[PDB]
Amino acid sequence: MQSIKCVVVGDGAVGKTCLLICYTTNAFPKEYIPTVFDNYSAQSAVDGRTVNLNLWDTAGLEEYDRLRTLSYPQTNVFVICFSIASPPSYENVRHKWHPEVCHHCPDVPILLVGTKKDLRAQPDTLRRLKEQGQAPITPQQGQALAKQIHAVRYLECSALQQDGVKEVFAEAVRAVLNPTP
Amino acid sequence: MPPPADIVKVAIEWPGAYPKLMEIDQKKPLSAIIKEVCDGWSLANHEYFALQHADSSNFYITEKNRNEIKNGTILRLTTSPAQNAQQLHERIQSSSMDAKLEALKDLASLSRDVTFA
């Protein structure tokens, strides 16, 4: 019944606007429309507990660094989307997200979902990544990264296929209910 | 045939608290808007709350300049002007110098409205 505040962040150019449009209209537009900020208040009850999903859209622009960092302290939960097979994404995450969230608040549950996984069926991105001499991230290193960021259980959901998103939210709520000591 | 414009999106922020979403129709009188807000948020004493613009102007909603409201704009809830005036008057003769300083600064900054003056 305890409604908890939420902040949704992610890497640049990942499909935040598409996700927001899908959430607000139950659609899937491939067109990209610039978005400054958004906030969705959803009344969803899981396991008999009424918690309001206070969604927050964030911008990775340099000008709004102070605006983004204003709500970072004292945040109770994060929804982060990142590319699974982007070594630059891993480097940026290790440089910015994990050390800060670990040092500031050791007891803030964080929900992490990997994105950009349905591109395997498209040979275009495979050829683009092939010409630069880049290889996909090994599963063992990904699992080590997932277990080394103080995560009880790492899970991913598909947005294009609409599979596991509600399950991901439910398991995140359950983990918040029973977190690590 | 233009699509209906009776539905709008606006977030009402709070100091230290995250906003909540509701649809606001400016055609109806402000009393009806306040009553609907109180019904939605289950807040009593409807006369002790008001609305303001969180932009650079930092002004309250007025009948002559209410068209500045735009979708996707940051707006935060504030205390009613009557309560602000009462607390400023109480802190005019307060025992704290810093309280007097900040109260006078806020009064000087927020003295650009005619009806509230």
**DSSP assignments along chain B, one per residue:** -PPP-----EEEEETTEEEEEE---SSS-HHHHHHHHHHHHT---GGGB--B--SSS--B--SSS-TT--TT--EE--B-HHHHHHHHHHHHT-S-HHHHHHHHHHHHHT---TTT-
Return all residues near A1 (Cβ < 8 A) that are at least 6 apart.
A49, A50, A51
- Among candidates A93, A133, A131, A132, which has minimal Cα distance to A115? A93
Select from A5, A39, A71 the Cβ nearest to the Cβ of B21.
A39
For this PDB entry, the determination method is: cryo-EM
Residues in chain A closer than 8 A to B37 (CB atoms): none
Contact assessment for residue A8 and residue A108, using Cβ atoms and an 8 Å cutoff: no
| Alpha-carbon gap, residue B18 to A103, rounded angstroms | 23
Nearest to A54 among B18, B72, B74 (CB): B18
Q: Is A49 helix (H, G, I), strand (E, B) or coil?
A: strand
Extract the tokens encoding A148.
């080394």
Rounded Cα distance, B87 and A27, in Å? 49
What are φ and ψ of residue B61, in 5° steps? -75, 125
Which DSSP string do the residues of A20-44 spell out, in sequence order?
A: HHHHHHS----S----S--EEEEEE
Cα–Cα distance between A34 and A40 in angstroms, integer? 17
Contact A147, A155 (CB under 8 A): no
Please name the residue of chain B whose CA is at the shortest distance from the CA of residue A4.
B18
Instruction: Round to whole Å and give the CA distance between A77 and A110.
Output: 5
